[PDB]
Coordinates of C-alpha atoms and ligand atoms in Angstrom, one line a residue:
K1 CA -11.3 10.0 -0.6
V2 CA -8.2 12.3 -0.9
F3 CA -6.4 12.4 2.4
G4 CA -4.4 15.4 3.8
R5 CA -0.8 14.5 4.4
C6 CA -1.0 14.7 8.3
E7 CA -4.5 13.1 8.1
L8 CA -3.3 9.7 6.4
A9 CA -0.2 9.4 8.7
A10 CA -2.7 9.4 11.6
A11 CA -5.0 6.6 10.1
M12 CA -2.0 4.3 9.2
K13 CA -0.6 4.6 12.8
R14 CA -4.1 3.6 14.2
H15 CA -4.1 0.3 12.1
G16 CA -0.7 -0.8 13.3
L17 CA 1.6 0.0 10.3
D18 CA 4.1 2.2 12.3
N19 CA 7.2 -0.2 12.3
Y20 CA 5.4 -3.4 11.0
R21 CA 8.1 -5.9 10.0
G22 CA 10.7 -3.1 10.8
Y23 CA 9.3 -0.3 8.6
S24 CA 8.6 3.3 10.1
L25 CA 5.5 5.5 9.4
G26 CA 7.2 7.9 7.0
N27 CA 8.1 4.9 4.7
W28 CA 4.3 4.0 4.4
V29 CA 3.3 7.7 3.9
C30 CA 6.0 8.2 1.2
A31 CA 4.9 4.9 -0.5
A32 CA 1.2 6.1 -0.5
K33 CA 2.2 9.6 -1.8
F34 CA 4.0 8.1 -4.8
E35 CA 1.6 5.1 -5.4
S36 CA -1.7 7.1 -5.3
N37 CA -1.2 11.0 -4.2
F38 CA -3.2 10.0 -1.2
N39 CA -6.2 9.0 -3.2
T40 CA -8.0 5.7 -2.2
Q41 CA -9.8 5.5 -5.6
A42 CA -6.5 5.0 -7.5
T43 CA -6.3 2.1 -10.0
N44 CA -3.7 1.1 -12.7
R45 CA -3.5 -1.8 -15.3
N46 CA -0.4 -4.0 -15.7
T47 CA 0.9 -5.6 -19.0
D48 CA 0.3 -9.3 -18.0
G49 CA -3.4 -8.5 -17.5
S50 CA -3.4 -8.2 -13.7
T51 CA -4.5 -4.9 -12.0
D52 CA -3.3 -2.6 -9.1
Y53 CA -5.8 -1.2 -6.5
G54 CA -5.9 1.6 -3.9
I55 CA -3.6 3.9 -1.7
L56 CA -0.8 1.2 -1.9
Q57 CA -1.7 -0.3 -5.4
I58 CA -2.1 -4.1 -4.5
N59 CA -2.0 -6.6 -7.4
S60 CA -4.5 -9.4 -8.6
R61 CA -1.9 -12.1 -9.7
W62 CA -1.4 -13.4 -6.2
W63 CA -3.3 -11.4 -3.6
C64 CA -7.0 -10.5 -4.5
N65 CA -9.8 -11.9 -6.7
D66 CA -11.1 -9.8 -9.6
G67 CA -12.4 -12.6 -11.8
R68 CA -10.3 -11.5 -14.7
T69 CA -6.7 -12.8 -14.0
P70 CA -6.3 -16.4 -15.5
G71 CA -4.3 -19.0 -13.5
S72 CA -4.0 -16.5 -10.6
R73 CA -4.4 -17.1 -6.8
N74 CA -6.3 -15.1 -4.1
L75 CA -3.9 -15.4 -1.2
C76 CA -5.5 -12.4 0.8
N77 CA -9.0 -14.1 0.5
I78 CA -10.7 -10.8 -0.6
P79 CA -12.3 -9.1 -3.7
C80 CA -9.9 -6.4 -5.2
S81 CA -12.8 -3.7 -4.9
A82 CA -12.2 -3.7 -1.0
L83 CA -8.9 -2.0 -1.6
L84 CA -10.8 1.3 -3.0
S85 CA -12.8 2.2 0.2
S86 CA -12.5 5.5 2.2
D87 CA -11.9 3.0 5.1
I88 CA -8.2 1.8 4.7
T89 CA -8.6 -1.6 6.7
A90 CA -8.5 -4.2 3.8
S91 CA -5.5 -2.4 2.2
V92 CA -3.5 -2.4 5.5
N93 CA -4.3 -6.2 6.3
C94 CA -3.2 -7.4 2.8
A95 CA -0.1 -5.2 2.9
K96 CA 0.9 -7.1 6.1
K97 CA 0.7 -10.6 4.3
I98 CA 2.7 -9.2 1.2
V99 CA 5.5 -7.6 3.3
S100 CA 5.9 -11.1 5.1
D101 CA 6.3 -13.2 1.8
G102 CA 10.2 -13.1 2.0
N103 CA 11.2 -9.8 0.3
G104 CA 9.9 -7.0 2.6
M105 CA 8.8 -3.6 1.2
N106 CA 10.8 -4.4 -2.0
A107 CA 7.5 -6.0 -3.1
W108 CA 6.5 -2.3 -3.9
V109 CA 8.7 -1.1 -6.8
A110 CA 8.0 2.7 -6.2
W111 CA 9.0 2.4 -2.6
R112 CA 12.3 0.9 -3.7
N113 CA 12.8 3.7 -6.3
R114 CA 11.4 7.0 -4.6
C115 CA 11.5 6.4 -0.8
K116 CA 14.1 3.7 0.1
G117 CA 17.2 5.7 1.5
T118 CA 15.5 9.2 1.7
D119 CA 14.6 11.5 4.6
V120 CA 11.2 9.7 5.0
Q121 CA 10.6 11.5 8.3
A122 CA 9.8 14.9 6.5
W123 CA 6.5 13.3 5.4
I124 CA 5.3 13.4 9.1
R125 CA 6.9 16.9 10.1
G126 CA 4.5 19.3 11.8
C127 CA 1.7 16.7 12.3
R128 CA 0.0 16.1 15.6
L129 CA 0.5 12.2 15.9
Ligands
LIG1 CL1 1.9 16.6 0.3
LIG2 CL1 9.4 8.2 9.7
LIG3 CL1 -9.2 -14.7 -11.8
LIG4 CL1 -12.7 -6.1 -18.0
LIG5 CL1 -5.8 -19.2 -3.8
LIG6 CL1 -14.1 -12.5 -4.6
LIG7 CL1 -9.6 4.9 7.5
LIG8 CL1 12.8 -6.9 5.6
LIG9 NA1 -6.4 -13.3 -8.3

């Protein structure tokens, strides 16, 4: 599924991301825009042989099982395919464990490079929330 801009902001708020561990709604929308263009079916392969999955691009080295990442862990206790659903629940729950690991939203490199410090509120302007 490809979400409308105002449509995803509404679903993320419903699942309790608005200010989780101190991060506002526009930070999560911006992160999704640049990680996936609002597409839940987004995937991308990393050089160490791990893979990234879904609207927020979560990785198989630590966080999910895909059966193809040697010596890895499954700290979220889930298969990576759950991160591709039109239902965003598994993606939101695992992003909560990751953002708590010690380093906050710096765990997402594109958030640090395209959305940290910017007028993130513009991503929610004109939306009925
Ligand atoms: Cl847009
Ligand atoms: Cl915001
Ligand atoms: Cl594995
Ligand atoms: Cl393969
Ligand atoms: Cl494990
Ligand atoms: Cl599994
Ligand atoms: Cl949803
Ligand atoms: Cl933090
Ligand atoms: Na794994």
